[PDB]
Design a protein around this ligand. Structure first.
Ligand code: CHL
Ligand code: CHL
Ligand code: CHL
Ligand code: CHL
Ligand code: CLA
Ligand code: CLA
Ligand code: CLA
Ligand SMILES: CCCCCCCCCCCCCCCCCC(=O)OC[C@H](CO[C@@H]1O[C@H](CO)[C@H](O)[C@H](O)[C@H]1O)OC(=O)CCCCCCCCCCCCCCCCC
Ligand SMILES: CCCCCCCCCCCCCCCC(=O)OC[C@H](COP(=O)(O)OC[C@@H](O)CO)OC(=O)CCCCCCCCCCCCCCC
Ligand SMILES: CC1=C[C@H](O)CC(C)(C)[C@H]1/C=C/C(C)=C/C=C/C(C)=C/C=C/C=C(C)/C=C/C=C(C)/C=C/C1=C(C)C[C@H](O)CC1(C)C
Ligand SMILES: CC/C=C/C/C=C\C/C=C\CCCCCCCC(=O)O
Lengths: 34, 111, 222, 53, 60, 223, 220
């Protein structure tokens, strides 16, 4: 059961870190406006 | 070489004399509540501490202003000395020191 | 840039204008203008001191990481060293099981202190002779900088741009100075408290207003 | 700068709340021994482990 | 008892960490992603054809 | 092997080429080209350091010999000293009930008061060292201050320049070894708390057990 | 005297000053036997260090000798009168009271003392090395002006004489402070107590007889 908890924690933190550091990567500049 | 300097490193003095002297000095009322034209003409921002406050018009001319300035300066200095010497010994005696007649309005009867 | 030239940061903030010497012109990494004792007036002694400082910085960084690692790996992992405290880890060579790497009886299992010392003397003498002479075996590493070699010592090529190289030099020297100060702290804390560097941190975090130098040990030092 | 000024003001307000429970008569404590009553908080819990918990 | 369980629900742990392995997993993954982002954040900024001065960003 | 010039023996053997400083040109005895901290990059400081090193070397020779001799004499039965045989236990001898008896005989020195010893030593060595610093005394000496010769060279072994240079190298090389040995004496006395010859005997009893690492846990801090 | 090529030296009649010690600065007795001041820049830095150390040592010696004398004479009562135990009074129940009465300082925290000292001393030292309210271009070691209220050093000759006197007093203070530290280390007693014990029985109470034979193999 501890292995499942470790695996789920790893997956969740991976996806949340992806979300955070993707929205930190100059997101407002990705628009078609001139 | 100079006899004065800033308290916070290099290039720190930044003395702004245009705030207490001249026509742009701060008055006793904000700019919204009082225009600069209502100020007594005798108070032209020359003496220190001139906030343009004279509702009763007691400054008729320069001589009266100078006499009142002398009186005010003397009273002010005596007031600083009196306030310090009336507040400090009482606190000293109340904190645990041995002072007789600590309160200012009772030290005369001590001797 | 920001870290070079006459506009670089200095070690006294706004009060540092009147203390910077005329030879600390902001040409080398870590230049903050601190030469109050005037021990680097001679350019030759200045260069030797710079080499000594950088070598000390690298050694101190390695030492700090290695002093804090096995103690962290014992309380917060399943590893069981013979002794995790840095100033008590040398006595493992006299234990019945010898020195076992990571607590495993089949990883290193060193038993003799003389053989370890002899091997260390041979290897370290060879490498330090190569470094001091500026040229390794069979002419290897000739013409390279004696302090920032690069080439075979930079496999990843992180310093192939002069500006990036200068910035990384500044980062390295600042991290090294911080590590040196931290190792001095490690030494004095080991002398006074007698516990590991991590135990002191955790005990302080248990109650910061109650477990300090002043609250526990200051009055017993005189 | 404006954000910092207002942060200082809010911190002063929090400290003003703190002073009431210590020196200016205290605050009502519903777990006080012998029934709830207006106590004085003398030993607040400032442990990092308790606050972070 | 008849069986075994983690027995951690309704306890009040920091981030639900009862074992240091969870802390290690979180820290390792976060550090890896942060390092990958940190290497490239210089190149990403240069796609705007502007320098990251005090006037950078989407402003109105 | 040469000891002067660019082909002299150096402090790292055949690998000293890249580590010899420019200012160490091989002009003075004992020049192995060892200056990694750059402490002698100024000629005046270099000369003062050379003088200090030579004086320290001579004092180290005298100290090592005087630390080793009385213990050997006591162990071989040529004299009796009690607990004053060890080199760091002469203050026990001066504060003895019978006093500091030279060679154990109470008729040679028989010193009793410690203040008198200090005063005479201070006067004598103040005169000697002041004369040395002044550079001119009541004796016959050469121009050199480090190597005076003359009155201090009765047998006259410093006439030929080549032999004088070789003897300077021999003197500095024995003095450096004496300094190293005296530092070892100090550290051994502080750590083991025994005699140097006692340490040698104990080490020879079991070289693989009685070494410096057997007392490495002595100064361990405790909570 | 005190200057030029005819000033007293550090050995007496046996005079041999180095080439870089011309007798241009106060306290120049021609004592550089290690060549540490062969570089003029290092010489100036060492001069400034020596003067600052001298002033600090005079202040420290006076402050280490005053409260113990007052307490031993019975004039005043302190929580701890010995100089190397005066810092631990902040951990006592009553705090730290100046001269013993609770209406003078009544300090209670060590963190506040540390932070206030950091801020104030940093500001005043930055003033000293850069210039502040009391001047901007004055001398580094002898600024004068606001720090010479009652003009005592105005004649150039009297200024030099006072410089020499200050340096000599400060050097004596430095030696006395080193003596204080080592004496407290060995004897675990204050300087005044050591002086009184010595003056009681000069032969019995000393260093050699008392502690020297117990300096190898036995405790103190
Ligand atoms: C600055 C002006 C001044 C003022 C406002 C007061 C004010 C006061 N005096 Mg003081 N005194 C002043 C100057 C002087 N007094 C005294 C000597 C005394 C005595 C002897 C007494 C007072 C007392 C009093 C109090 C009686 C009303 C009153 C608070 C009397 C009192 O009622 O004390 C409680 C009293 O006993 N005063 C002297 C002579 C040294 C003064 C000037 O030199
Ligand atoms: C025999 C090959 C050789 C080997 C195995 C090493 C090995 C090592 N060198 Mg050395 N060096 C070698 C030749 C040379 N080194 C240097 C100059 C240096 C420097 C400047 C430094 C090292 C350091 C290091 C250590 C970590 C480096 C990563 C490691 C022990 C580093 C060290 O000792 O700090 C802990 C470091 O600072 N070496 C030069 C001059 C170009 C060499 C010439 O061949
Ligand atoms: C080719 C190999 C060779 C090597 C490696 C050396 C190396 C050395 N020589 Mg040289 N030499 C070599 C060839 C030759 N030498 C000389 C002639 C000389 C002389 C005449 C002298 C030297 C000296 C020295 C030493 C100078 C640097 C030093 O002291 O710090 C390097 C050392 C360290 C930084 C650490 C040592 C490593 C050790 C494993 C540490 C272990 C630590 C402890 C176990 C733990 C400590 C506990 C804590 C509490 C502190 C150094 C050991 C000088 C000297 O210092 O002699 C004593 C000296 O005077 N050499 C000749 C004759 C021409 C050589 C011929 O090839
Ligand atoms: C070469 C320098 C020198 C050295 C390294 C030592 C070293 C030692 N002496 Mg010695 N002494 C030295 C010169 C002198 N001593 C003495 C007189 C004494 C006495 C009276 C005693 C020592 C003792 C000691 C031990 C520590 C005591 C101390 O620090 O006070 C010595 C002061 C040094 C300036 C230590 C092993 C003590 C001892 O061995 O206890 C058992 C002790 O009782 N020494 C005199 C006066 C003639 C010296 C003159 O130069
Ligand atoms: C909420 C913040 C706030 C701010 C940022 C401003 C900002 C400004 N005011 Mg306005 N003002 C406010 C509220 C505020 N005001 C309130 C509540 C009143 C009613 C009294 C006024 C009445 C007013 C007048 C009459 C004038 C201005 C003017 C100005 C300018 C300052 C010049 C001056 O002399 O004023 C100084 C004004 C004061 C009221 C005197 C100072 C009183 C001290 C600071 C109060 C101490 C109380 C403490 C800080 C608050 C505790 C309560 C809090 C928890 C709510 C500036 C643009 C001037 C201007 O427009 O010139 C053309 C001017 O003429 N203001
Ligand atoms: C500055 C240099 C430095 C030095 C001198 C030491 C010295 C030592 N380390 Mg430390 N250490 C360091 C840095 C250093 N460490 C760093 C940077 C780390 C992080 C990786 C560690 C992590 C570490 C661990 C995990 C362990 C030690 C252990 C030890 C001791 C046994 C040596 C050994 O068995 O190696 C033999 C190793 C090799 C032949 C090569 C190893 C190569 C890879 C990494 C495997 C010894 C006190 C051991 C111990 O006794 O702990 C108390 C042990 O278990 N160290
Ligand atoms: C350093 C000067 C300064 C100061 C002292 C303040 C202070 C204040 N501002 Mg801010 N403000 C400033 C600069 C400053 N401002 C500037 C330059 C601007 C741009 C114009 C503003 C814009 C601004 C606006 C638009 C408003 C305020 C408001 C307020 C008040 C909020 C607190 C409150 O809501 O009470 C509750 C919180 C507390 C913690 C209790 C008080 C505890 C005491 C202070 C202790 C407070 C009096 C707000 C307000 O309340 O106006 C009356 C408001 O709406 N400010
Ligand atoms: C705070 C930084 C935020 C940075 C930006 C984040 C952007 C959004 C990212 C995605 C967020 C949603 C998905 C999160 C999934 C992982 C979390 C999870 O499942 O935890 C689930 C775990 C459950 O942990 C359980 O614990 C038990 C013992 O207590 C047992 O051990 C269980 O085995 C264990 O699973 O809970 C936590 O990890 C606690 C999280 C506490 C968070 C405190 C945040 C404080 C700061 C923010 C305050 C405001 C928050 C919002 C409040 C208002 C909301 C309307
Ligand atoms: C982290 C970098 C390391 C530098 C120092 C550590 C930071 C210092 C912050 C506390 C300053 C105030 C206390 C001194 C003044 C003092 O007297 O200390 C004492 C007090 C606790 O001790 P007591 O009140 O029990 O005892 C008082 C006396 O013993 C001290 O004289 O400190 C506290 O912890 C109170 C809560 C502070 C909470 C501050 C905000 C949170 C800080 C940490 C943030 C974490 C990451 C974000
Ligand atoms: C000349 C020469 C030359 C050649 O070339 C070389 C040589 C030889 C090297 C040289 C020499 C030198 C020398 C001798 C030196 C010395 C020094 C010292 C001793 C110092 C001190 C010094 C000292 C000092 C500063 C001191 C200080 C002090 C102080 C602050 C104090 C304080 C305090 C007080 C008040 C009281 C309290 O309760 C406590 C405290 C808080 C603690
Ligand atoms: C127990 C103490 C043991 C110490 C080891 C003893 C002797 C080692 C002697 C010399 C070290 C030589 C190191 C290698 C130098 C030459 C390198 C090369 O060019 O191959």
């Amino acid at each position: 059961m501890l292995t499942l908890k470790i695996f789920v924690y790893t997956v969740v933190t991976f996806f949340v870190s992806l979300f955070i550091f993707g929205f930190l990567s100059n997101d407002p500049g990705r628009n078609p406006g001139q | 070489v100079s006899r004065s300097g800033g308290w916070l490193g290099s290039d720190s003095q930044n003395i702004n004399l245009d705030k207490w002297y001249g026509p742009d000095r701060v008055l006793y009322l904000p700019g919204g509540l009082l225009a600069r034209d209502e100020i007594n003409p005798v108070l032209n921002g020359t003496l220190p501490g001139d906030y343009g406050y004279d509702p009763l018009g007691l400054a008729k001319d320069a001589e009266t202003l100078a006499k009142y300035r002398a009186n005010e300066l003397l009273h002010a200095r005596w007031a600083m000395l009196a306030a310090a010497g009336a507040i400090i010994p009482e606190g000293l005696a109340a904190n645990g020191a041995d002072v007789k007649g600590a309160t200012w309005f009772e030290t005369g009867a001590a001797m | 840039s920001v870290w070079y030239g006459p506009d670089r940061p200095k070690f006294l903030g706004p009060f540092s204008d009147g203390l910077v010497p005329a030879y600390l012109t902001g040409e080398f990494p870590g230049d903050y203008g601190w030469d109050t004792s005037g021990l680097s007036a001679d350019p030759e002694t200045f260069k030797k001191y710079r080499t000594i400082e950088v070598i000390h910085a690298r050694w101190a960084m390695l030492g700090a990481l290695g002093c804090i690692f096995p103690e962290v790996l014992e309380k917060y992992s399943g590893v069981q060293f013979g002794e995790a405290v840095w100033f008590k880890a040398g006595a493992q060579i006299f234990a019945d099981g010898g020195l076992n790497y990571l607590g495993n009886s089949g990883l290193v299992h060193a038993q003799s202190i003389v053989a370890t010392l002899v091997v260390q003397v041979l290897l370290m003498g060879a490498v330090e002779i190569y470094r001091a002479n500026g040229e390794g075996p069979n002419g290897f590493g000739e013409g390279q900088d004696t302090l920032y070699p690069g080439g075979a010592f930079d496999p990843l090529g992180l310093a192939d741009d002069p500006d990036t190289l200068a910035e990384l030099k500044v980062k390295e020297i600042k991290n090294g100075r911080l590590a040196m100060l931290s190792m001095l702290g490690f030494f004095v804390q080991a002398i006074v408290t007698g516990k590991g560097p991590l135990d002191n941190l955790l005990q302080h975090l248990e109650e910061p207003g109650e477990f300090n130098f002043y609250a526990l040990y200051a009055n017993s030092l005189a | 700068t404006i954000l910092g000024i207002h942060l200082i003001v809010l911190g002063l307000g929090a400290w003003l709340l703190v002073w009431k429970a210590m020196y200016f008569g205290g605050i009502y404590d519903t777990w006080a021994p012998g029934g709830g009553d207006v106590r004085i908080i003398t030993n607040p819990t400032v442990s990092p482990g308790v606050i972070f918990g | 008892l008849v069986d075994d369980r983690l027995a951690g629900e309704g306890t009040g742990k920091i981030l639900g960490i009862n074992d240091p392995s969870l802390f290690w997993a979180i820290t390792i993954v976060f550090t890896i992603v942060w390092g990958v982002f940190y290497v490239s954040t210089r190149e990403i900024d240069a796609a705007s054809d502007r320098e990251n001065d005090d006037d950078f960003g989407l402003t109105l | 092997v040469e000891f002067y010039g660019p082909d002299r023996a150096k402090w790292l053997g055949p690998f000293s080429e890249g580590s010899v400083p420019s200012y160490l040109k091989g002009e003075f005895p004992g020049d192995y080209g060892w200056d990694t901290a750059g402490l002698s990059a100024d000629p005046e400081t270099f000369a003062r350091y050379r003088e200090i090193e030579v004086i320290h070397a001579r004092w180290a020779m005298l100290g090592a010999l005087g630390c080793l001799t009385p213990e050997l004499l006591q162990n071989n039965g040529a004299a009796d000293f009690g607990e004053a045989a060890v080199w760091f236990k002469a203050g026990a001898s001066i504060f003895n009930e019978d006093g500091l008896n030279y060679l154990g005989n109470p008729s040679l020195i028989h010193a009793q008061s410690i203040v008198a010893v200090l005063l005479t030593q201070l006067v004598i060595m103040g005169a000697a060292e002041a004369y040395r610093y002044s550079g001119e005394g009541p004796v016959e000496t050469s121009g050199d201050s480090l190597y005076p010769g003359g009155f201090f060279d009765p047998l006259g072994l410093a006439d030929d320049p080549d032999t004088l240079a070789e003897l300077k190298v021999k003197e500095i090389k024995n003095g450096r070894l004496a300094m190293f040995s005296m530092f070892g004496f100090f550290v051994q006395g502080l750590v083991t708390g025994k005699s140097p010859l006692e340490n040698l005997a104990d080490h020879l009893a079991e070289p693989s057990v009685n070494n410096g690492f057997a007392s490495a846990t002595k100064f361990l801090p405790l909570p | 005297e005190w200057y030029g090529p005819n000033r007293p030296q550090f050995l007496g009649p046996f005079s041999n000053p180095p080439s870089y010690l011309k007798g241009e600065f106060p306290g120049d007795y021609g004592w550089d036997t290690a060549g540490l001041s062969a570089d003029p820049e290092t010489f100036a830095r060492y001069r400034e260090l020596e003067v600052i150390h001298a002033r600090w040592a005079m202040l420290g010696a006076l402050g280490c000798v005053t409260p113990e004398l007052l307490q031993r004479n019975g004039v005043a009562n302190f929580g701890e009168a010995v100089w190397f135990k005066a810092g631990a009074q902040i951990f006592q129940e009553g705090g730290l009271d100046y001269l013993g009465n609770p209406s003078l300082i009544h300090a209670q925290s060590i963190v506040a003392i540390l932070l206030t000292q950091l801020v104030l001393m940093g500001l005043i030292e930055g003033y000293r090395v850069n210039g502040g309210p009391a001047g901007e271009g004055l001398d580094a070691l002898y600024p004068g002006e606001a720090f010479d209220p009652l003009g005592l050093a105005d004649d150039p000759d009297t200024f030099a004489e006072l410089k020499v006197k200050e340096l000599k007093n400060g050097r004596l203070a430095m030696v006395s402070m080193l003596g204080f530290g080592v004496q407290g280390l060995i004897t675990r007693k204050g300087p005044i107590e050591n002086l009184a014990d010595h003056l009681a029985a000069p032969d019995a109470t000393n260093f050699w007889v008392d502690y020297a034979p117990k300096s190898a193999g036995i405790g103190y």
